[PDB]
Amino acid sequence: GPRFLKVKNWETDVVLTDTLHLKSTLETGCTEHICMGSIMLPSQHTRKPEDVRTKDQLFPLAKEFLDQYYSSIKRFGSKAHMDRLEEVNKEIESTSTYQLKDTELIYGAKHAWRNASRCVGRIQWSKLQVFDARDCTTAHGMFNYICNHVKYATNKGNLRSAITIFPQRTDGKHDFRVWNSQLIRYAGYKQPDGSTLGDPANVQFTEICIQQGWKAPRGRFDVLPLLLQANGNDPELFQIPPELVLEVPIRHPKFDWFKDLGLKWYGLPAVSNMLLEIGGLEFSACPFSGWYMGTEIGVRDYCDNSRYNILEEVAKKMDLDMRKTSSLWKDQALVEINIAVLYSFQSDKVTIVDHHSATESFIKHMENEYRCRGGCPADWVWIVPPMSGSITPVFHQEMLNYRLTPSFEYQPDPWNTHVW
Amino acid sequence: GPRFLKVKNWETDVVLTDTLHLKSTLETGCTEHICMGSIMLPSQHTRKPEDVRTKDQLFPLAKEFLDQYYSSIKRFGSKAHMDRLEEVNKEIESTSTYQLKDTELIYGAKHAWRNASRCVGRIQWSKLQVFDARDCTTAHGMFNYICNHVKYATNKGNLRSAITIFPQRTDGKHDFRVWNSQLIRYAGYKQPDGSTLGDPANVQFTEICIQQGWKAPRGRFDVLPLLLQANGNDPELFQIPPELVLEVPIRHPKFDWFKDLGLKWYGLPAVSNMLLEIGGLEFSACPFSGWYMGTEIGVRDYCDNSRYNILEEVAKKMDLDMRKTSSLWKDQALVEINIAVLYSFQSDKVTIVDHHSATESFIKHMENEYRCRGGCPADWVWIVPPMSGSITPVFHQEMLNYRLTPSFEYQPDPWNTHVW
Ligand code: HEM
Ligand code: HEM
Ligand SMILES: C[C@H](O)[C@H](O)[C@H]1CNc2nc(N)[nH]c(=O)c2N1
Ligand SMILES: C[C@H](O)[C@H](O)[C@H]1CNc2nc(N)[nH]c(=O)c2N1
Ligand SMILES: CC(=N)NCc1cccc(CN)c1
Ligand SMILES: CC(=N)NCc1cccc(CN)c1
Ligand SMILES: [Zn+2]
């Protein structure tokens, strides 16, 4: 195209013209002579530990969002729009910052998710519960908001989307950081015999909680303590009330022996280490959650090598021909494990989506976004399920990726930064 | 990095610094504000039907390759290098073109494959048989070279890499085009009852051969006739000697009923519709072949929706719960089908590689290319197998993609262009 890029679905032949990319301003990390589409943290905006943005750098960014917001409600250049702008301009000049109206905070949150190029479940983008935790001032208060979130979202297995937003970053006042990767996760212990008990991806965090006092049960599926950081103060340990952490015992609809593998997982996926940016405002603590896509647990959490890595054992138990890789025994154990997850979650009536339905609705969503927003940023490398990618429609779907604001961003783990 | 990009393997944590990308000059299609890493034909150089490159545009490109070639043999700026350059400069001035020495043609061919960012089997790059078909002048002569290629490469099931290079493009003299996508492929017929018999992806080509006289057996696995175009003359039909087309009957090492599905495939993957560019020279007819990676046939050729699409039938026969998608019945049928392919090919002793071993050696190859060539262009979207992607090491492998020359490129199907 000359300026209206096209994306084609190669299985269906459908074509979509993108005009939305012209609103992008952040960099992708790619050039004209190089593509970094498969790089995890291309760092085009992977946050910096350095000082906070300034007054000059702040208003343009704040204005951009507000011009965007009022345009959304077809009120661009209104008396209201204009006064709001002077309002924030005036408020930034004095305080070096500014506070978003409650409506603006919801728009910004919903849209950060609508713009998350790596999320395949964005069709749910408009249905999000926003918990304004901006008045919070302590870790205990943070703990409380988090508990309410957990309970609200789990909703006795009938999961609901939600995000809790703590105080924005200021400068000296300080940062609020949920030191945990996800609200709910299992511990990992480096055994003296080389082996690792529990999720290996958490061995480094688990060591923090312990050197902070945690009474580690030292088992396989030990839900880790919350370690909250409020107003730039040292984090504090908190135990999520067990009765609030919904879990699901993994069993197979045919292999009764599967049960004996002792596999269990939590039903609430709550990302809590990213950053929400709206109008140039940084919300370093914005735990968000939705519900699982089966492969997340079955393929990655369980079968990833550096994670639980249950391929052999599951394979052995199946009595599979592990003599050579051409027996596709890994692929076989992998399909069964994933059938056990969906089956289990669905048996206990906990919300879950399989890769087939998930990716099917994303195409539907893409079609909505191109038919109403002029496009949709999608990261093909992330949107395509980690198993049977080709038999899911998104594989054959060309996808344009670009960075839109407001958005969710990665940020430095605080234990690297924080002193004391 | 500041100029030395880094790629990390997220499962192994290994890191590789790339310096090779600085040699790139062709565009990727990506910008600073947009990524097109998941676009099939980003058209940065998807050929053009327009006139051929000119004398001025030709020498720089020719020089680049020669400077590259002599640098390879540590002879940069030699008397030889310099005289060769004047040689070609002189030869281009008179003829508007130039002919590559036989050594240069092999270097260029091997490296087009070494630079093919989308090919996962490049570890085999240095072991390639080059058949110089530049003296060819007819379709019959083209047919002959092709037959020798087939026979050579099949090597009674002990497949060998090879590429046959026909006369370069000139201007008026004309184009040589193997009108076939791949040397060996099956026909596809649009049934009156809506249905499609045989590979649907070939229904449009099959119609050409028929309106050219082909006596279509009108079955499911009808190897199509060769339709060769020589010196810009109308293509001509040729039947590959049946005794040269090695095929493999698909059966399963446990499901005797699988046999009854009547699945068969050819063992020689021979791409014949691309373009080889060396020193600015265009080789519009350069059929190349290696050997199969199981998923190519099992996942794509067979299960792709718009292809053979054998999911249901295979699933039904398995007596799988197709009530809902969460039964992962597609995933189940998909794993079995692929076990049948490897098993079959390996039984008849025909060369084949599974995704596990294939992707394992690519990592090994990447490590070689970074440890000796300063890098390796890889397209993550293509290099990752269409099934069980996450349990194969390349999924966790960050990959930098850039365009190096010499290379293989896509080109317009000639029936759209060619008159008469
Ligand atoms: C309704 C359920 C949802 C589903 C099924 C869904 C599914 C997915 C999946 C499968 C991933 C991959 C995670 C990984 O591989 O680590 C992902 C990533 C992501 N999702 Fe969603 N999502 C949903 C809701 C949410 C919510 C509520 C938000 C925000 C309001 C969100 C924001 C994102 C972001 C930012 C990522 C990128 C993660 C990263 O870059 O590390 N998702 N999602
Ligand atoms: C020794 C066996 C080889 C293996 C196992 C291998 C494997 C692969 C696979 C699995 C694909 C994907 C094809 C598709 O999805 O349509 C591919 C693509 C490709 N391979 Fe290789 N390859 C090998 C040899 C060759 C040879 C001999 C050449 C050239 C000298 C070559 C050049 C390429 C190119 C240019 C592509 C890109 C196709 C496209 O863009 O449409 N390959 N290869
Ligand atoms: C839309 C998307 O680019 C397209 O479906 C790609 C994805 N990856 C692929 N990878 C390989 N090896 N082969 C293909 O044909 C494709 N198709
Ligand atoms: C190296 C590569 O970028 C990395 O392994 C990516 C690939 N695609 C992914 N896709 C999803 N959804 N999640 C991931 O963690 C990854 N990892
Ligand atoms: C909401 C959802 N389905 N998954 C997002 C997610 C959950 C846990 C960890 C991570 C780390 N990227 C992401
Ligand atoms: C050599 C190899 N393994 N496969 C390359 C290939 C074979 C047939 C068709 C196509 C179309 N892209 C590519
Ligand atoms: Zn890119």
CA atoms within 13 A on the CB side of B9: 19
CA nearest neighbour of A44 among A366, A347, A320, A410: A410
Give every CB contact of residue A171 below 8 A, 6+ residues apart in sequence: A51, A52, A96, A97
Query: A299, A338 in Cβ contact below 8 A?
Result: yes
Q: Do A388 and B334 touch (CB under 8 A)?
A: yes
- Positive or negative: CA dihedral A332, A337, A342, A347: positive
Write the residue in A21, A34, A335 that is nearest to B328 by C-beta.
A335
Query: A162, A128 in Cβ contact below 8 A?
Result: yes
Helix (H) or strand (E) holding B94, with range, is: helix B79-95
Q: What is the layout of strands, in order, in the sheet containing A177-178?
A: A177-178, A226-229, A236-238
Q: A122 an active-site residue?
A: yes
| Total number of residues shown for chain B | 420
CA nearest neighbour of B240 among B229, B226, B220, B222: B226
Q: Which fold has domain A135-160+175-246+410-414?
A: Nitric Oxide Synthase;Heme Domain; Chain A, domain 2 (3.90.440)
Catalytic residue among A53, A84, A122, A251: A122
Q: Do A380 and B27 touch (CB under 8 A)?
A: no
CA nearest neighbour of A185 among A287, A310, A276, A258: A287
What span, in angstroms and rounded, lies between the C-alpha atoms of A297 and A304?
10
CA nearest neighbour of B222 among B191, B195, B199, B192: B199
Give the rounded distance of the alpha carbon of B34 from its chain centre: 27
β-partners of residue A264 are A249
What span, in angstroms and rounded, lies between the C-alpha atoms of A346 and A17?
38
Helix (H) or strand (E) holding B380, with range, is: helix B380-383
- Mutational pocket test of ligand 4: of A381, A384, A410, the residue with most ligand atoms within 8 Å of the beta carbon: A381
Closest CA in chain B for residue A299: B390
DSSP for residue B173: S
Q: Do B388 and A388 touch (CB under 8 A)?
A: yes
Q: B86 an active-site residue?
A: no
Give every CB contact of residue A301 below 8 A, 6+ residues apart in sequence: A199, A265, A307, A308
Give every CB contact of residue A316 below 8 A, 6+ residues apart in sequence: A322
- Positive or negative: CA dihedral A81, A82, A86, A87: negative
Least Cα separation, residue B176 to chain A (angstroms) = 28
Query: B279, B62 in Cβ contact below 8 A?
Result: yes
Give the 3-state DSSP-derived string for chain A, with helices as H, strands as E and coil as C: CCCCEEEEECCCCCEEEECHHHHCCCCCCCCCCCECCCCCCCCCCCCCCCCCCCHHHHHHHHHHHHHHHHHHCCCCCCHHHHHHHHHHHHHHHHHCCCCCCHHHHHHHHHHHHHCCCCCCCHHHCCCCEEEECCCCCCHHHHHHHHHHHHHHHHHHHCCCCEEEECCCCCCCCCCCEECCCECCCECEEECCCCCEEECHHHHHHHHHHHCCCCCCCCCCCCECCEEEECCCCCCEEECCCHHHCCEEECCCCCCHHHHHHCCEEECCCEECCCEEEECCEEECCCCEECCEEHHHHHHHHCCCCCCCCCHHHHHHHHCCCCCCHHHCHHHHHHHHHHHHHHHHHHHCCCCEECHHHHHHHHHHHHHHHHCCCCCCCCCHHHHCCCCCHHHCHHHHECCCECCCCCEEECCCCHHHHCCC
Helix (H) or strand (E) holding B228, with range, is: strand B226-229
Ligand 2 within 6 A of CB of B377: no
Query: A154, A243 in Cβ contact below 8 A?
Result: no
Residues of B annotated as binding site?
A: 38, 119, 182, 291-292, 296, 381-382, 395, 410
CA nearest neighbour of B153 among B302, B298, B266, B235: B266
CA nearest neighbour of B344 among B268, B245, B270, B258: B258
- Positive or negative: CA dihedral A340, A341, A342, A343: positive
φ, ψ for residue B352, nearest 5 deg: -160, 155
Q: A10 an active-site residue?
A: no
Ligand 1 atom 29: residue of nearest CA: A113
CA nearest neighbour of A294 among B325, B59, B322: B325
Both tokens assigned to B148: 């020798």
Query: A177, A200 in Cβ contact below 8 A?
Result: no
Interface test with B, best of A3, A6, A331, A343 (most B CBs within 10 A): A331
DSSP for residue B225: P
Q: Where are the domains of chain A?
A: 18-134+161-171+275-289+359-383, 135-160+175-246+410-414, 247-269+292-357
Ligand 4 within 6 A of CB of A201: no
Q: Do A37 and B33 touch (CB under 8 A)?
A: no
Atom of ligand 2 nearest to the CA of B118: 37
Q: Do A37 and B35 touch (CB under 8 A)?
A: yes
Q: Are strands B352-353 and B292-293 parallel, antiparallel or unpaired?
A: parallel
Residues of B in contact with A343 (CB under 8 A): 326
Helix (H) or strand (E) holding B5, with range, is: strand B5-8
Query: B253, B343 in Cβ contact below 8 A?
Result: yes
Please name the residue that has the structure tokens 């070096």.
A96
Ligand 4 atom 11: residue of nearest CA: A382
Distance B2 CA to ligand 4 centre (A): 24
Q: Is A292 known as a binding-site position?
A: yes
- Mutational pocket test of ligand 3: of B28, B39, B40, B117, the residue with most ligand atoms within 8 Å of the beta carbon: B40
Atom of ligand 4 nearest to the CA of A120: 12
Q: Are strands B281-283 and B275-278 parallel, antiparallel or unpaired?
A: antiparallel
Query: A13, A398 in Cβ contact below 8 A?
Result: no
Atom of ligand 4 nearest to the CA of A381: 8
CA nearest neighbour of A262 among A202, A186, A206: A186
What span, in angstroms and rounded, lies between the C-alpha atoms of B36 and A7?
10
Closest CA in chain A for residue B7: A39
Closest CA in chain B for residue A253: B327
Q: Which fold has domain A247-269+292-357?
A: 3.90.1230
Q: 10 Å Cβ neighbour count for B296?
A: 19
What do you get for the CA distance between the two ends of chain B, in Å?
A: 55
What span, in angstroms and rounded, lies between the C-alpha atoms of B68 and B75?
10
Residues of B annotated as binding site for L-arginine?
A: 182, 291-292, 296
Give the SS3 label for residue B216. Answer: coil
Ligand 2 within 6 A of CB of B161: yes
Distance A70 CA to ligand 6 centre (A): 51
Query: A291, A271 in Cβ contact below 8 A?
Result: no
Helix (H) or strand (E) holding B93, with range, is: helix B79-95
Distance A10 CA to ligand 3 centre (A): 9
Q: 10 Å Cβ neighbour count for A334?
A: 29
Helix (H) or strand (E) holding B18, with range, is: strand B15-18
Q: Are strands B270-271 and B352-353 parallel, antiparallel or unpaired?
A: unpaired
What is the phi-psi region of residue A143: left when phi exceeds 0, alpha when psi lies from -120 to 50, beta otherwise? Answer: alpha
Catalytic residue among A104, A236, A282, A296: A296
Give the rounded distance of the alpha carbon of A415 from its chain centre: 20
Q: Cis check for the bond before B249: say yes or no (omega within 30 of 0).
A: no
φ, ψ for residue B394, nearest 5 deg: -65, -20
Q: Would you say domain A18-134+161-171+275-289+359-383 falls under CATH 3.90.340.10?
A: yes
Give CA separation, A31 vs A47, A401, B26, B153, in Å: 20, 13, 11, 39
Give the rounded distance of the alpha carbon of A418 from its chain centre: 23
CA nearest neighbour of B399 among B113, B125, B126, B120: B120
Please name the residue that has the structure tokens 């490296």.
B111
Q: Do B34 and A21 touch (CB under 8 A)?
A: yes
Ligand 1 atom 42: residue of nearest CA: A119
Q: Experimental technique used?
A: X-ray
Give break positions in chain B: residue before each, C–N beyond 2.5 Å. none
Q: What amino acid occupies position A165?
A: I
CA nearest neighbour of A368 among A168, A160, A114: A114
Ligand 6 within 6 A of CB of B292: yes
Give every CB contact of residue A207 below 8 A, 6+ residues apart in sequence: none
What span, in angstroms and rounded, lies between the C-alpha atoms of B324 and B284?
48
φ, ψ for residue A360, nearest 5 deg: -70, -45
CA nearest neighbour of B150 among B169, B167, B129: B129
CA nearest neighbour of B370 among B70, B136, B22, B19: B19
What span, in angstroms and rounded, lies between the C-alpha atoms of A340 and A253?
7
Both tokens assigned to B6: 């880094």
DSSP string, B329-356: HHHHHHHHHHHHHHHHHHHTT--EE-HH
